[PDB]
Amino acid sequence: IEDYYVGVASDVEQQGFDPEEYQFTCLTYKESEGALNEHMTSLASVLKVSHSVAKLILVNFHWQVSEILDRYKSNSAQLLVEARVQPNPSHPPHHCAVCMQFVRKENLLSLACQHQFCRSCWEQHCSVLVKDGVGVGVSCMAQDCPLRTPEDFVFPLLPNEELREKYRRYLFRDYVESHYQLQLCPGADCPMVIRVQEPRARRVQCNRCNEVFCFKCRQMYHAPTDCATIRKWLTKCADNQSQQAQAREALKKYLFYFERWENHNKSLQAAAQTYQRIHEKIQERVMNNLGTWIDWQYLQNAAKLLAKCRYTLQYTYPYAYYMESGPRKKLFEYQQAQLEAEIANLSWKVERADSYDRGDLENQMHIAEQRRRTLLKDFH
Amino acid sequence: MLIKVKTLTGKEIEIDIEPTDKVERIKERVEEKEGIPPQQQRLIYSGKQMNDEKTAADYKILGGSVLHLVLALRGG
Amino acid sequence: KMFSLKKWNAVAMWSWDVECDTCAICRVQVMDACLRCQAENKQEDCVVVWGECNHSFHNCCMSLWVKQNNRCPLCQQDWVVQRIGK
Amino acid sequence: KNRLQDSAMKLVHAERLGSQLVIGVRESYVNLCKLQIYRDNFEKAYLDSTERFYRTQAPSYLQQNGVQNYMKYADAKLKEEEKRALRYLETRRECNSVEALMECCVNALVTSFKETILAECQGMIKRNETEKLHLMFSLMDKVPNGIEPMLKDLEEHIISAGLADMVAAAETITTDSEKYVEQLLTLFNRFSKLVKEAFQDDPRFLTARDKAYKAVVNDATIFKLESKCPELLANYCDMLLRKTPLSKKLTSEEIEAKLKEVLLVLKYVQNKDVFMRYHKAHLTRRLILDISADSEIEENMVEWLREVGMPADYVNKLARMFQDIKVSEDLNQAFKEMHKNNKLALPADSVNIKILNAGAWSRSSEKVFVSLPTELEDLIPEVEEFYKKNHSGRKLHWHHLMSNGIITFKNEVGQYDLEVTTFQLAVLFAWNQRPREKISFENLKLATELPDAELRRTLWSLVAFPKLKRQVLLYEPQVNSPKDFTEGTLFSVNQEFSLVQKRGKINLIGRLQLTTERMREEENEGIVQLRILRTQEAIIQIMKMRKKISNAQLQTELVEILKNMFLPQKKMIKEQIEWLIEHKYIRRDESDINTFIYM
Ligand SMILES: [Zn+2]
Ligand SMILES: [Zn+2]
Ligand SMILES: [Zn+2]
Ligand SMILES: [Zn+2]
Ligand SMILES: [Zn+2]
Ligand SMILES: [Zn+2]
Ligand SMILES: [Zn+2]
């Protein structure tokens, strides 16, 4: 009766889901800078190159070390040309071409393109660019020249500390943007960065300001669609027979989806009142001597499940509107209608109901979750 | 390296080899132990017939491993 | 002879002799029951239908689909019932 | 008018320390002017006198006798002031004077010194100060928004005491399921009694108790760090429901009460799916072995599980399992009625079958390689074709881990019988021939077709049974771990094994395994190839020895020749006969096609 239950923890595990699963590592403002510095040091050591050129290489190739190494081994000459480090392969002037004034040799700086200009013009150009919010976009003055000024060249041309600090901020922003694993928080002055192994379009939540957004595009979480369809759908929502009859039919078809989109949008937007009403309907049940606080707890789970299922439905309608008419679209719409009906049933059983039975409500929860998973499974 | 080779009747023959020993030399060890000719010797390990040209270590044989000796069909 | 047998208790598990193991309408595995039947507790009354297009579904889901329209949701061919499970 | 009301206070001042005169004045000013003038003059003065007197007096008593006596003094003063208000103030004319005076008095006597009492609140929750806790709760309820620190302190004390007790008693609790449940029940009962006595079961305090116990039960201090509470609860449920000695002495009502207590505790766990998985596995073992203490208790148990709020999947699965048990009970009787006439080697009265759904029970289309005896290979096709009669479009996947039976053992001392699984069955049948002989660990791996790990586990369970002193199989190179078995290990049957009763029955199935590893196909293919080669060699050798021999003698001589290698199967024998007749190694007799000729 005691040696019986020794190895039960493993035998019971006959078989072990979450189609939208994702592992986002949360990093602060300084941890991201440390990671960038570590990557830059590793690349500079490997390629035996300076820090600024290594940063240029990383920016031009989205900080993908393996591809950088492969392209360096294949051909180093074109790697620096594409990264705008050296000019394409295919005696002092003592006269600036943009200010037409003769200057000393020491004040005549130039990049690898050997486009020589006086120091004052360099300072003016770098100052105006950094004032205009330009980060890694600083380039040579000469027209058609794609070469870019490295970090060790821009900094000496910045007179005061505030311009240097703004340059550093813009460089950090551009580095986070170009990195294929780091994305800035789209919040209001949220100083946070999200890091992940591989880039995808899934759900991320900044634990500091509790904002949910799509990873690949810093927009609202469009679950079943892609980052291109939702953009044009939101753009549109803002502003045999004859062609006019076709236009009328198209308007009718557009309305057939827009009405459901708006319905679910408003229903989701009005959820705080539902939560408060359920809290009050639980308080009224618990103050009277029937049950306790632990018995009436599943109604909050019900409210959360309805909110999640409505959010899932709201974004399947733009998906079904931009689909090729075939055997697949009809089945998708049939499943969508089934899920709509079951959400209506559960919402009636939770909100506008008097006597709550836990078995029936749990069955409804399970059915609704299964239908939501079925709707989301095919694409992702 | 001291390995073990099995016959049909259940009798066992014990031989000592080297990791670099070619399986042919294993056959001639069988003949210096028993009077069965090499042409009638088929040796099978892990359900696989060993080819003549091969080292024992190439067949992943270990110390106490057991070999199976199956007679040639028409030759016997 | 030593070690002779006296009593035995065989155990076997049955499943539908189908392919693709999925109704493709509710995406529930065929060996289980459809969601409505499972909720309503009317078990063992949910069976599997076949088709001349060699596609398998639940009887309930296919009945609802034919109430919608008469065509296989997988291959756009007219639905003709080949055989019923049980 | 002001002269009379001024002198009333002097009389009131005397009575506060230690009637009609005031009542007549009150009535005269009530009716002189409809209560507006009484609401302006008189009322304000009375409230001001009360406030001034009590603000002057109460702190002195507080620093004189401390909080413990000050609370009682405040309660007595409140009651006396309420009586004085009801006897000296207009209340029968729908006047809010009583309510206003009570609000002023409670604000002057409780709100002014609430922190000093709340510190004592934090102090006295322990050491069972209920007699004054009740008085304090009565005092603080009158003040709006005043009882929340009491709730917070009660929650904190409950959490701290529970965690401390769990840590202090964690020696005999982590590894034992009885003590865990007993400690949880004792803690819950103690704190429930505390709440009931101190605050007469107020709903807010019950809510605080529930919220605290929810955190108490879900604590990460069991494995000095995972989720093991559901496993212990499921083990306790199994002990209550199985035919263990613990449940042997208890009555049905007591078992039901214990189960109800367990479910009451179960209402607070967070991951109920783990508990449902463990309970499903335990119920599977119970139903297959048929060792349940009471079936109706189990059905009421699944109903109560549905009521408690378990996930809707596993409850429906359990209902399906019970329905399938009933269906298989009918099917077995039908099959036995069919089979009653044409008796086989196994009489129809000693064979049972159980056809179960593959979705509710274990769902796995995995292949298991076992060399079954001849009595079991002549039964699968019969059951398959019987099932293919009334049902159409249904498959059958035979389960060899869950199958079990009873065999008998014949020593030189006495005859016994065992309770074995299919794996131990196949391992034991290797000794039907070569009775008093040693078999290596490698000849067993071929004669039973079992993989290495399963063979090791089965052999260890067969030679190292815990309770028994004598055993059935013994091996020479003794070791204390199954993982150290070597290919040269020798096993033999214990000819002197006994229970010294000449007959008896013992059990060898303790927690029949429900899951195995993915048996690699390469090893089984190699074993099959070696078996084919060996049987070809044996057949050709016996043909060479005797060029003319019938078919009946072939199997007997093949069994005799192949006794120290493995037991040949009839199907493989026939297949090899065909494969050799096709290659002119042997010749079929022309006159009667049953005898073979070698050329
Ligand atoms: Zn210039
Ligand atoms: Zn240039
Ligand atoms: Zn944020
Ligand atoms: Zn996106
Ligand atoms: Zn279906
Ligand atoms: Zn159904
Ligand atoms: Zn079809």
Author numbering:
A (entry chain H): 35 to 50, 54 to 127, 134 to 282, 351 to 491
B (entry chain N): 1 to 76
C (entry chain R): 28 to 113
D (entry chain C): 152 to 169, 174 to 188, 194 to 385, 401 to 674, 680 to 779
Reported in the publication:
In the best-characterized E3-E3 pathways, ARIH-family RING-between-RING (RBR) E3s ligate ubiquitin to substrates of neddylated cullin-RING E3s. The E3 ARIH2 has been implicated in ubiquitylation of substrates of neddylated CUL5-RBX2-based E3s, including APOBEC3-family substrates of the host E3 hijacked by HIV-1 virion infectivity factor (Vif). Structures of ARIH2 alone and bound to neddylated CRL5Vif-CBFβ reveal the HIV-1 hijacked E3-E3 ligase assembly that overcomes host restriction and defines mechanisms by which NEDD8-linked CUL5-RBX2 activates ARIH2.
A triple Leu381Ala, Glu382Ala, Glu455Ala mutant, which we term ARIH2*, was relieved of autoinhibition as monitored by autoubiquitylation. We obtained cryo-EM maps for two ARIH2* complexes with neddylated CRL5Vif-CBFβ, one with the substrate APOBEC3C and the other with APOBEC3G (hereafter A3C and A3G, respectively). ARIH2 catalytic Cys thiol is shown as a yellow sphere. c, Color-coded schematics of subunits and domains of neddylated CRL5Vif-CBFβ and APOBEC3C (A3C). d, Model of ARIH2* (full-length ARIH2 with L381A, E382A and E455A residue substitutions) complex with neddylated CRL5Vif-CBFβ and A3C in cryo-EM reconstruction low-pass filtered to 7.5 Å. Coordinates for ARIH2*, RBX2 and a portion of neddylated CUL5 (CR3 domain through the C terminus) were built into the map shown in Extended Data Fig. 2b. CUL5-linked NEDD8 does not approach ARIH2*. Their closest residues are separated by more than 30 Å. NEDD8’s Ile44-centered hydrophobic patch makes extensive noncovalent interactions with CUL5’s WHB domain. NEDD8 also binds the edge of CUL5 in the intermolecular C/R domain. One interaction involves ARIH2*’s Ariadne domain binding CUL5 and RBX2 in an E3-E3act superdomain. Here the loop between the first and second helices of ARIH2*’s Ariadne domain docks in a cleft from CUL5’s CR3 and 4HB domains. The third and fourth helices, on other side of ARIH2*’s Ariadne domain, bind RBX2’s RING domain and the junction with CUL5.
